[PDB]
Amino acid sequence: HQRPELVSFDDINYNDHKKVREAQESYTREQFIRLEALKTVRKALEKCYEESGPNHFEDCKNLAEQYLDMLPTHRLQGYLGYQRNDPSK
């Protein structure tokens, strides 16, 4: 059902706390959307595999390309940091 409007978290000056909560709610929803896209990728990959038999290189590679591209991304939300003055790692 319902579709809350995303707020663009970096734009609202951090006192209007309902907007801040709706921003972090929306950002976490966007995280879950890219996650569910990754789930779509895996459900496609299993069907390609069990149709393929031994046919990895035929038509199942190009799933695995953006699969192992998308997997180190699309995981966490954290917080959009203020200034990023000190990097590490």
Next chain:
Amino acid sequence: FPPLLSQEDMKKHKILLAYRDRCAALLVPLNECRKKNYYMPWACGHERHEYEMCEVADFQRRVKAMDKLKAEKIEQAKAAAA
């Protein structure tokens, strides 16, 4: 003799790598035996032996390649002394 090297038939005849060699098409009479039969040893005496003898031919040409490689290395070991 290995008759052919197809590729899309060799995909639709859903066979795997290291069976995807030469003499590969002769699995097509074999497995079509094995599922129409029940892949017992009293399933296909002739048809298994056909593919088996093709594999024997591949083995012997590999032995000839081994002969060539050993001959070249021994002749290099001869020539290196002068």
